[PDB]
Amino acid sequence: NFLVVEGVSKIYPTPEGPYTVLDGIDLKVREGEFVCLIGHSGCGKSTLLNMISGFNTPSEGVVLLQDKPITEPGPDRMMVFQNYCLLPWLNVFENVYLAVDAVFPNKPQAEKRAIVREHLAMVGLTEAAEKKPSQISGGMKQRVAIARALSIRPQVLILDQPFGALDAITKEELQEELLQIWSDHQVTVLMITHDIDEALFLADRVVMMTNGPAAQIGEILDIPFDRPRNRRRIMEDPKYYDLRNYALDFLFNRFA
């Protein structure tokens, strides 16, 4: 109805033959949902979300957004890249300002400028607004990509491990901010996480993919918690500490 993945697959031509990454993945993501895609390293989480963002054409399959095939990346499908693609010649302010000006140039300065300023303060890079990416740390590079994506406020958000290089305090702070902007708008978030505690706190549904070649979706879960999720209370519910080890069970079972 909103975002349909219809039997997509990915074959990568290698000198040793054909390598299969994806095989028969089906998804039905409704508007405004939060989906966390977890799995092993090298199973195909980034490849699967690349097709939704338009960066990878499926070998056999099609991805539809509102009954429309996806073939080219757009600004309504903003992505947070796993490598934090930032332009080295721009500052933290200019990197975010590039996305703001490109997706809507109609309004003049001092209004789109304020959008950049508030998003830098949201991630906490207020002091780091005049330095190049070569002068900031890896975690600070991550927050520039987050601020760049959140400023556009796209129809659907695609995140590829957006909190990997952040400490516990900073990561938890950004999770709440991500949730706040997720509810105040109609943003659909497709998120990749390697932390089980992170996926359960944010996602409405948790999707796991099998490891190795020809990876398909296995044992999709639902997350039945009250919408205003808060820490120190979601762990208190009996629905926690059994969904979590269920995810750990699948991750450990996929080995060999």
Partner: protein, 246 residues
């Protein structure tokens, strides 16, 4: 306090200026040394430039200035054409594959071979000299810009693909800042080639301009023959050095 950026040029200038003199100790070495070169031409030329003796004997100040306006116009047109074409050729790999050979076969034509062809095309011989400068010092700018665009990292292109960065916005925000070393190196080589083809280009104009001064001094063998052209080359290099640092 520039002790490592103004002194090493002078220290390095000490070499190739004294060993040049020692190279003349060999009797077979007919090339004049720095002492001979800077003394034979000292009286009429090094004493004062910008002197007029009628006809076309304008010393060296006007000769290097008259040719400066020729290479300046030729390089400016080639720099604009080379950069724009290189960006257009760098993108759209089908277009790069389309005109691949007719740019390669057209860039091996010597400026002396361009002299008769440009005469027939332009029957004024004033813009013919400009074309020789333009068509010679355009391939380093064109090739370096094309290779620079083709070598843009996918990370910057991915950022451009997500946003609606296409057309002039894509070139001015992604293509140009990324390919700065390639474009500027092509301009650096292009500057040298504008002066490298000034002797041939100014074969269709009067006796004023460096390149006509070099040509007629090479044809007429006198006692102060090699010294005159060597001093002219030094003037060209210094002018090309200021143009390089610009």
């Amino acid at each position: 306090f520039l002790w490592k950026k103004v002194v090493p040029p002078l220290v390095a200038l000490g070499i190739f200026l004294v060993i040049w003199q020692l190279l003349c100790l060999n009797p077979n070495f007919k090339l004049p040394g720095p002492i001979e070169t800077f003394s034979e031409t000292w009286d009429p030329f090094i004493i004062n430039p910008f002197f007029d003796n009628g006809e076309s004997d304008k010393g060296l100040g006007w000769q290097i200035l008259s040719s400066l306006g020729r290479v300046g116009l030729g390089f400016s047109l080639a720099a604009i054409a080379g950069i724009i074409l290189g960006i257009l050729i760098g993108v759209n790999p089908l277009v790069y594959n389309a005109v691949d050979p007719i740019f390669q076969v057209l860039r091996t034509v010597p400026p002396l071979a361009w002299l008769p062809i440009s005469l027939a095309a332009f029957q004024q011989a004033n813009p013919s000299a400009i074309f020789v400068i333009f068509i010679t010092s355009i391939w380093p700018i064109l090739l370096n810009t094309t290779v620079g665009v083709q070598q843009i990292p996918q990370d910057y292109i991915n950022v451009a693909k997500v946003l609606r960065l296409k057309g002039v916005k894509y070139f001015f925000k992604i293509v140009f800042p990324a390919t700065v070393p390639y474009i500027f190196t092509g301009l650096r080589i292009g500057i040298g080639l504008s002066w490298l083809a000034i002797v041939a280009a100014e074969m269709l104009v009067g006796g004023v301009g460096i390149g006509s001064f070099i040509w007629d001094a090479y044809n007429t063998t006198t006692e102060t023959n090699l010294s005159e052209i060597i001093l002219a080359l030094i003037y060209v290099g210094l002018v090309g050095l200021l143009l390089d640092r610009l």
